[PDB]
Design a protein around this ligand. Sequence first.
Ligand SMILES: Cc1cc2nc3c(=O)[nH]c(=O)nc-3n(C[C@H](O)[C@H](O)[C@H](O)COP(=O)(O)OP(=O)(O)OC[C@H]3O[C@@H](n4cnc5c(N)ncnc54)[C@H](O)[C@@H]3O)c2cc1C
Ligand SMILES: Cc1cc2nc3c(=O)[nH]c(=O)nc-3n(C[C@H](O)[C@H](O)[C@H](O)COP(=O)(O)OP(=O)(O)OC[C@H]3O[C@@H](n4cnc5c(N)ncnc54)[C@H](O)[C@@H]3O)c2cc1C
Lengths: 588, 593
Amino acid sequence: GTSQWLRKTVDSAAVILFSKTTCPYCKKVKDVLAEAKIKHATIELDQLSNGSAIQKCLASFSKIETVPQMFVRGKFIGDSQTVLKYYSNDELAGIVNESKYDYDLIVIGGGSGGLAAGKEAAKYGAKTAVLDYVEPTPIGTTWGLGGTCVNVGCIPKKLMHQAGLLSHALEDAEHFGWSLDRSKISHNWSTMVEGVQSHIGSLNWGYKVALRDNQVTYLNAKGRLISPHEVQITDKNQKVSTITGNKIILATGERPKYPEIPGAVEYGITSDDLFSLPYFPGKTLVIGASYVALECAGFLASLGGDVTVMVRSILLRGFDQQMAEKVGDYMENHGVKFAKLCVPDEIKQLKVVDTENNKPGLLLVKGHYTDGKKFEEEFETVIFAVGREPQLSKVLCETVGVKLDKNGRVVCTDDEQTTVSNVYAIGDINAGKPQLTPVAIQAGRYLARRLFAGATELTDYSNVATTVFTPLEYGACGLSEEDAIEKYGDKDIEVYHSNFKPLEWTVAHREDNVCYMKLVCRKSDNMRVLGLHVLGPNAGEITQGYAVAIKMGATKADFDRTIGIHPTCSETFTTLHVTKKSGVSPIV
Amino acid sequence: GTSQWLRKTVDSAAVILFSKTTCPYCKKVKDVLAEAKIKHATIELDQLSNGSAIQKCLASFSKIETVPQMFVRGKFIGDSQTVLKYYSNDELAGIVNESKYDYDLIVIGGGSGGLAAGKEAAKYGAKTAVLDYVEPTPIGTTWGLGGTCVNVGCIPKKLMHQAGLLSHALEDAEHFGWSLDRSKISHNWSTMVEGVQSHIGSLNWGYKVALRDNQVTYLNAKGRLISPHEVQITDKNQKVSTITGNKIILATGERPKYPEIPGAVEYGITSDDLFSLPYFPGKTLVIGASYVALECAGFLASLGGDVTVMVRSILLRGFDQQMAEKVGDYMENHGVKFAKLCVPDEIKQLKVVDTENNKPGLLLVKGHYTDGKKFEEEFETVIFAVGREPQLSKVLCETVGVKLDKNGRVVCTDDEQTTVSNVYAIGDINAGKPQLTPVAIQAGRYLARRLFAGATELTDYSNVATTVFTPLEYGACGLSEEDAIEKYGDKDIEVYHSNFKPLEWTVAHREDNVCYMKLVCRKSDNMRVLGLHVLGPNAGEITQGYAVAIKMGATKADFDRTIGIHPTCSETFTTLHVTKKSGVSPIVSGCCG
Ligand SMILES: Cc1cc2nc3c(=O)[nH]c(=O)nc-3n(C[C@H](O)[C@H](O)[C@H](O)COP(=O)(O)OP(=O)(O)OC[C@H]3O[C@@H](n4cnc5c(N)ncnc54)[C@H](O)[C@@H]3O)c2cc1C
Ligand SMILES: Cc1cc2nc3c(=O)[nH]c(=O)nc-3n(C[C@H](O)[C@H](O)[C@H](O)COP(=O)(O)OP(=O)(O)OC[C@H]3O[C@@H](n4cnc5c(N)ncnc54)[C@H](O)[C@@H]3O)c2cc1C
């Protein structure tokens, strides 16, 4: 067992040090490499029960069995004696840097997973190179280091969500005694975008510098994979180059799909454009039903905008449809108009964008309904939230032969390994993995540890909790009710559910029976909580804690035994009693 | 033992039916009892691991082994044919009403635990009586059914807390692009208390109906447990009677302590008085350092008040002390003055409460410091929050023999049983139990079930999560740091921790590195999470979910495995790596990277 583990580890590590805490020579060397500013991976043999047979199995690599044993890229370099010998002449900084390639690792793409990976690898020695190029949107939009989430994703999305939530905090303030007129108050999109952009702006820098502070060579270059070890980089002005790499990680992410219809690319905008947009979108049509679509439709509405969402079939496909229904309903009951069962045929420009005045154009959206009826309306802005796609034909020469799936995504074994043994893929592009930022970060960190630090641990992609950040938030962990029903059958699935009202809402004279949560369990299995769902404020803060207990395989009995914190939204989980089969109402 | 149980179920349950889920004549008997509006507990034997043992063992009460078998108050009343025979002759509703005592249960205290228990026992066919009487405070303040939490506790507490959060959310709006100065806006306290009371009003009524709906006899009366089964009662106009009850539930709650100093009861108020006070408190002094003390100081400050807090010794005794300091230092930095190491000596009236203008008085607070300096300041109102005492001397007639402890609290077994074998106490009074609402409700329900439903499960009192609702909230679950070391030794205790900033706080320009969270773990036992602590927004919402995993015995490995939800405050618990004994600083370096 250990024979194969050790065979892969030393071969792939850049700067590694086998050691004991119990061996004095081993700790003395750690002191030296520290004041020599050498980053190395430390395997501690006294803290492992696979280790009993390592010193004996290091005879095949260096013909010795004493600790410490420092390796550099598969080949041995020396123990306490040879390390100090190489130190007292400045020769250590020259020996560690010795490399078969330009870099131990090249990371193509500087987004959530990309950056996370490069930063970790560098910690254990790897001379790392992270490449990031942002390709302009049709209309011309670009941004700094950080990837999707930082620049055009979670960060702006949630700050804008926040601006939107505060719209109703202002309303509620009045009921709680605060003497302010909500009617007289308005929102300045422009002010808000400055705020948001300024934060993103400082995040771009944070990263840029973070890589510097980690001996990670950051290049603002478009990377192309020409051969299993060679990456072709293009700079800000066409100077083509070819750095070599030992390990390759593909972390290039996705971009927003445009529907294949006239006028779309020319007059329509994606989420890429929305977050840095100079002027308030105005009367807006969102075309799509992804969490991206409803999130954006949701915060534009809250900022006093005229918002329509065009929906071809169902909202939030993949998500639990009872909950998606309740999400959509909340939004409809609050001004988001829906064009149900409807597609766009074309987008025609009625009016151009006024820059000198900072105001949107007018656009005409021609489309049809399912029953063939026409659709025709004028919108100031058209936003296209119809899925995202990886564009790896910009990154991969087919002649390297990295296998892509039915829809253009890197097919990987469970170690994020591609069909090409030194090439790896993480994040949004790794087929079948949930497409979320902590998922990519985790995937990346755990991969760096396996490659350049001899770790075993794999990234667990199951029961990864999510939050859709709509006007009323939706938090989820585990299977949707319908999925749970297909897996272990209807008679096996019990659903304990309930409506609830945040105490903050009572005085504020908001809805009863609109906030809602449910637990989806499997009775044959002790009533195992397969799935947790909640619609209400701070849904993500609510959900996060249970994602742990679910990972650990919680049952309904666990939830019951746990005591509530009062007054909170989240507690209502701890005292759930009404099941769906009983037909009893879940209202208060 | 399996038999030991059965005896306990037949002798205690008001109305119980023994059953199988598959047996058609059980289904018929069930349906029949539902149509005749009869409430009963049920035990489905086909889903009890000791099933065939209990069934054969039933013969000692009924003489039969068949199902179903109906029992009322320990009297076996018949098989299917017998019970069907009773149903169409309509004699059934009278056979369940037959009882030796007036009620199967007298609950004394219509508060959190009392109501919770009341409603629960009632559902299984136990005849139930909830007693509630609200003793007015010194200045003469009273409220309706519900208890402390409903009228003068959690509900008004967090509602006022919410109003304090809105203050800072008005500042925040401006940065997020909204058109308001929030520098000229003021807060109208009169409007807020109308709203807060309006709600407590509807909860008063709500709970009253709830009891009636479950056929619980609600008496707005003072309850004296005069004998093991006798409860003497005084209604609205000193008219006395007596009612009997098989089993008694004490859930009388505590009331706020006062100091032994002149002027206190005369000129000062307690939290009971605060949440209905018609005038704005004005320059307020809060004497204490309990969560009530801090919370009330917190939102009063935020609501535009001049607030000083006099601490005898330490902030939040009982709570992890590192967390208590941070909690305090926040409040100080946000305009809450603290007279530290300080106790009051007396209070004197300088102006009388203008009760026709909605304006406070003026009070002289003479006090001395830990060393001598003699403290002496004026305050428009003064609020005492020095802990809360049980008034069992007002309820429990001495001659019964129910053991109280050092502090006047009912000593119970871990099945809530007092020294008098049929009397139980639950909630704030059950000594040495965490004094919280969801505790008092869990205790009540679980008790009611054990008795009248034949359940076995007790209330788990270990690792109960809390959240102090100060300006920046404090959520906590399990052992403090000074207790994890104190019990398992420094060498065993590994503390992971980290500062954080809400993404919401960035644009709004609030503090980086004031929010803090930590995980007190134990090396030997696989890094078992013994404690979780969090200072930051929505701390209640954050903590709750983890209190479930903590319960099941969570290890750091478990937090590590779990993916974060981005962007949330709570997610910082999943990537914690920095430890204390390794020396690395908690501070989040920058907008990271
Ligand atoms: C509007 C929106 C909101 C979202 N909200 C959330 C949320 O709230 N919570 C959550 O968990 N997730 C959210 N996500 C998803 C999240 O953004 C992704 O899961 C995350 O970006 C995955 O990171 P990645 O490294 O795989 O790809 P990316 O972050 O996109 O990184 C890829 C980077 O590589 C660059 N690149 C591409 N090709 C090359 C090449 N030729 N050479 C050099 N560089 C290249 C790209 O420009 C890009 O910057 C949201 C996504 C969107 C679109
Ligand atoms: C300011 C404040 C804030 C709080 N905030 C929280 C919080 O945020 N979260 C939390 O979990 N807990 C909180 N608590 C604690 C919570 O209020 C108590 O833990 C809970 O109310 C205990 O319920 P109980 O049934 O044991 O007592 P109570 O709810 O007080 O029930 C006692 C009731 O019985 C009545 N009574 C007394 N004697 C008799 C008698 N002789 N006959 C008939 N009736 C009688 C009393 O009038 C009273 O209404 C707070 C407490 C206070 C004071």
